[PDB]
Write a protein that binds this ligand. Structure first.
Ligand SMILES: [Mg+2]
Ligand SMILES: [Mg+2]
Ligand SMILES: [Mg+2]
Ligand SMILES: [Mg+2]
Ligand SMILES: [Mg+2]
Ligand SMILES: [Mg+2]
Ligand SMILES: [Mg+2]
Ligand SMILES: [Mg+2]
Ligand SMILES: [Mg+2]
Ligand SMILES: [Mg+2]
Ligand SMILES: [Mg+2]
Ligand SMILES: [Mg+2]
Ligand SMILES: [Mg+2]
Ligand SMILES: [Mg+2]
Ligand SMILES: [Mg+2]
Ligand SMILES: [Mg+2]
Ligand SMILES: [Mg+2]
Lengths: 82, 98, 134, 59, 187
RNA sequence: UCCCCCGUGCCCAUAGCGGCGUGGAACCACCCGUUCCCAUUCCGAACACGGAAGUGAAACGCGCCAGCGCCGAUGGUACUGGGCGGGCGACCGCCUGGGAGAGUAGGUCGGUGCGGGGG
RNA sequence: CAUCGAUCAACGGAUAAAAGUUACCCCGGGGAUAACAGGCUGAUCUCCCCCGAGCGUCCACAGCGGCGGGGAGGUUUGGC
RNA sequence: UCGCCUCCUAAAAGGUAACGGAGGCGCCCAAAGGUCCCCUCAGGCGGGACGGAAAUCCGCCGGAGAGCGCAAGGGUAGAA
RNA sequence: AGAGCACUGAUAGGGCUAGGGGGCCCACCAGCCUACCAAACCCUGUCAAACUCCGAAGGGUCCCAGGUGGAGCCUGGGAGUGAGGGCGCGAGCGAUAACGUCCGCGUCCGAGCGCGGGAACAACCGAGACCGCCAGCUAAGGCCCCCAAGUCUGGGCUAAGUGGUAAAGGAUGUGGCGCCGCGAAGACAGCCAGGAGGUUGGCUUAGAAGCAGCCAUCCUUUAAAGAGUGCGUAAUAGCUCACUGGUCGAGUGGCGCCGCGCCGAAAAUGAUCGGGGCCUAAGCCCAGCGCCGAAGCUGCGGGUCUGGGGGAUGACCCCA
């Protein structure tokens, strides 16, 4: 019954929690993060912004919204105000 | 082609988009958000002479006169495809000096 | 071919899209129930048609084995079967037009498809044509 | 507008978790239990959610 | 060719789908009416009517409309139709298909060959007034290796095309024999 | 309030591609010269200055076509919540909600806000 | 306070410093786990058949059944 | 094989196992770092002394199919 | 999921065409045809976990509203658990085997081996058991006997014990449907009469007269015969095939589909749906009323817990 041993295909990597964090119409505070992502899939809009890892974080307190610039991408903004 | 239209749109508002043609030079002060123009300084649309460089230097002094009575102070330049050199400097260099 | 190695399976779900209609041909063969038709009954069904009529006709195979088989050899459990020891198979669901031919009447072709229809694990129904072209 | 009266003739055994928790929201604990409420469409959902367990009458 | 038809409305499709009826719909440029028709009546007629013959509908509104099929949503699996689209003709131009009745026996068939009527029908540009029946082709001087495109065609009066004259229509292919299995399983 | 031109912003191909006509009064571009600011990994090609010999050919904006491209219903279907049924088997069927994809008729050679100049 | 000495790679790292044999063996437990069988399957095995290209002096079927296809048994080799 | 990275299995929030299917890392860059400015590919067609299917050039077509150090994925010429 | 080919790759046919294969220009080194292999591109029709121009039901999150549930939150004391298993589904592995395994959702056993149907049968079906009662309603499932309840009513189906376990396949089993041919000028089956010359068609062989193979896809006298549907032949001759006539006398044939059946189908102690036994319905399809049924619900009684309520109260009294 004694057979062979082994291949090469069991390696994997561990999870990165890739997602939109806060969603549209969610109250967010200051500094919060909104989009953890790979690249510029959703782009930083009004009162948003990103460093290094494409991380959309609110510059200022407000409400989060989505608008679709079809061509120009997808944009997450911040409605400060109230 | 344009970039710096976007570069300013990051920071504040108050686009001062300058158009330069071979005999003409038009300089507005246009605000986004509301997406509406304001001080529409020009020369070939005003009445000034035609020596180009030393003509931009005066339309540059117009917005100052015209705007400082409208609640304006905040510079926010908008070089077009041009390169901050000749007429665009003279157009500019009178602005804050005005 | 060129492809790349081996592939999972795929539960033949809805007896559907794997389906067609007699295009470039007179009469054709249909599937009453699904299976995994192999690159060895096809040829076996193919040559069985030609041999019925020497010098004649044109047989239009319309399925292709683009799928890997996988079998291990008597061992235990490790890795995935390299397999292919029978080769390649073609995903076949009902309604599909397996074969269809042209070049003779029917008394010389109601059997050529009747024959090869016996080279299949699945029940078949010869298609006349029915000009229902879409 | 008339109310909503619902009776139950089936048991929540062999049926999922949320399906049960609705019956708590509607207040169904026993057998042939009669909870009569106000035909509000938010509530109708959980009746539409367990339509097979409960019997519905219009009052 | 005459053909009774009926109306379906707020009912449900699969209903008289069972009882032997058949659902459909008609449309032009300013009307869309869900309707239904008998199947065995549709199956009696369409087999030779096809996507070509004159199609008339004599609805219980007394109306009698010259129309055409243009989509057959057959039941994939179970060789039977399920739904039909109807185009309301009028007078304005229209694209449609015309049979390509080939005539004679070709030359390549003699020394081994079979006709492969690639397109028996051609999308054309024409008027409902002018309803051609077929476009004959003297396919005969064609041998094992001689094809025929949309270029090689004599068109009836008042009819023009919308496909491409750089397309294909028919061909005579070599046959298949048993002496050539050597070129196959053993190589 | 409207029409043309110029700068520009939004809706993101019912704006795009190709072809066809028009526009030069002002508009803008081509165009003259590189003396000075500036500049080309050679070059006034481009960036730039000075400017009126020439023109709307280019490029550009405006109107027509529908060939490509795009948009695209209704209808019906696959599929699927959820409840249920049949076959040991691969799988299939019923009911109530949801409802595609592609294919059809059809539509499309953009729409709009601000300022400035000229009507 | 700033910084250095890591295949501590068995990479949350027992020590700073570590390989084997036992059938001369023993102990504590495990069918949570292998051989013999009981059980599931039935890939292979044995038997059986369906079409029918051809053999059989002429002719598919007296007897034979290419390429294929579907089954019964659970006697083999195996899998669980 | 043991740590870490990319895709699927991952059943459309995250996450998900198997001695499942496929591939990488233990480096590197004083410029591959930041600021300001200029420029925008691969490929194809057709002409071009070398070479020659493929050398630098030129006209057209060319919206991303090139490039972004290394595996893969996301992203991206309205630049990175 | 689905579907599609616009990216990644895969593919059958045809087409036009870079390259090469046969053949001439037989060589300046190029060229034309091509039942040849072949990419670029197009149409026809497609394949995909690591393809997506699209795209769901569902899924997650914030707001609003219902929702008082042993909801949710916070602080602290204490534990236990961290081997699980079954079934339905979506995948991977495995042989589209395994009462095999690794995952996800949900369910249940474990902790419900406590009850009722499934003959028996932990997780299949119903249904959460606080106790008592010789009370009533029911779910699953059942109604000839063990075995409580219609040998119930109407309408079909099958002659095998199908029911009471299995295929590809064969068929002249049976019933229902639809699509047509024939026929009073006379049709299906039977019976009588005739059934031929050109022609031993051309190639083919020892031979090919129809019966070896290949090929096309003739002319006739006659009311009617086809380069012949089988046998038979070595080739032949012989019969019979359809076809014409008469006979004749109340009808006939062919295609496919479904509803139910037949065979296929051979194992080891003794055999059987649980057993008997069954318009032989006590089996299958449909419709209707009725009945039995579990600890589920209801009825009365008792206990205990949480909460409210009565008392200027221990206790007791009420209701959920
Ligand atoms: Mg991120
Ligand atoms: Mg319908
Ligand atoms: Mg005027
Ligand atoms: Mg450690
Ligand atoms: Mg010793
Ligand atoms: Mg062993
Ligand atoms: Mg047979
Ligand atoms: Mg055999
Ligand atoms: Mg950089
Ligand atoms: Mg790059
Ligand atoms: Mg799929
Ligand atoms: Mg609330
Ligand atoms: Mg029991
Ligand atoms: Mg109770
Ligand atoms: Mg009794
Ligand atoms: Mg036996
Ligand atoms: Mg025994």
């Amino acid at each position: 019954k004694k057979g062979l041993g082994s291949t090469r295909n069991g390696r994997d990597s561990q999870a990165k929690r890739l997602g939109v964090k806060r969603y549209e119409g969610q109250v967010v505070r200051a500094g919060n993060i909104l989009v953890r992502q790979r690249g510029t899939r959703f782009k930083p809009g009004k009162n948003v912004g990103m460093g290094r890892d494409f991380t959309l974080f609110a510059l200022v307190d407000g409400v989060v919204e989505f608008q679709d610039r079809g061509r120009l991408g997808r944009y997450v903004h911040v409605r400060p105000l109230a | 082609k344009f970039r710096v239209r976007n570069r300013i749109k990051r920071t504040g508002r108050l686009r001062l988009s300058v158009f330069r043609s071979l005999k003409h030079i038009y300089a507005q002060i246009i605000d986004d958000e509301k997406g509406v123009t304001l001080v529409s300084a020009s020369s070939l649309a005003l009445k000034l002479k035609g020596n180009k460089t030393e003509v931009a230097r005066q339309v540059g002094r117009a917005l100052a006169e015209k705007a400082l009575a409208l609640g304006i102070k905040q510079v926010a330049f908008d070089r077009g495809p041009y390169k901050y050199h000749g007429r665009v400097k003279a157009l500019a260099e009178g602005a804050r000096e005005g | 071919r060129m492809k790349y190695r081996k592939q999972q399976r795929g539960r033949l779900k809805g007896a559907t899209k794997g389906g067609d209609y007699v295009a470039f041909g007179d009469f054709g063969l249909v599937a009453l129930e699904p299976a995994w038709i192999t690159a060895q009954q096809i040829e076996a069904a193919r040559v069985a048609m030609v041999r019925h009529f020497r010098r004649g006709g044109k047989i239009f195979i319309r399925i292709f084995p683009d799928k890997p088989y996988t079998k291990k050899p008597l061992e235990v459990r490790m890795g995935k079967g390299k397999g292919n020891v029978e080769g390649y198979v073609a995903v076949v669901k009902p309604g599909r037009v397996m074969f269809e031919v042209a070049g003779v009447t029917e008394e010389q072709a109601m059997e050529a498809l009747r024959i090869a229809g016996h080279k299949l694990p699945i029940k078949t129904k010869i298609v006349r044509r029915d000009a229902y072209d879409e | 507008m008339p109310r909503l009266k619902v009776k139950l003739v089936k048991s929540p055994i062999g049926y999922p978790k949320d399906q049960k928790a609705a019956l708590k929201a509607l207040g169904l604990r026993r057998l042939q239990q009669e909870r009569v409420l106000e035909d509000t469409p938010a509530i109708r959902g959980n009746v539409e959610k367990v339509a097979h367990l409960v019997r519905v009458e219009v009052v | 060719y005459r053909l009774k038809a009926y109306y379906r409305e707020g009912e449900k499709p699969s209903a008289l789908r069972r009882a032997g009826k058949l659902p459909g719909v008609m449309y032009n440029r300013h009307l869309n009416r869900k309707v239904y028709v008998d199947l065995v009546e549709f199956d009696k007629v369409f087999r030779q009517a096809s996507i070509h013959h004159v199609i008339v509908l004599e609805l219980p509104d007394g109306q009698s409309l010259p129309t055409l099929v243009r989509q057959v949503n057959l039941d994939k699996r179970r060789r039977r139709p399920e739904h039909v689209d109807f185009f309301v003709l009028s007078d304005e131009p229209v694209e449609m298909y015309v049979p390509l009745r080939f005539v004679g026996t070709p030359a390549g068939v003699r020394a081994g060959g079979v006709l492969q009527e690639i397109h028996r029908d051609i999308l054309v540009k024409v008027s409902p007034r002018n309803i051609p029946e077929f476009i004959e082709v003297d396919v005969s001087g064609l041998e094992i290796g001689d094809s025929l495109h949309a270029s090689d065609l004599k068109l009836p009066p008042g009819v023009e095309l919308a496909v491409s004259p750089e397309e294909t229509i028919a061909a005579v292919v070599p046959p298949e024999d048993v002496e050539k299995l050597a070129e196959e399983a053993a190589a």
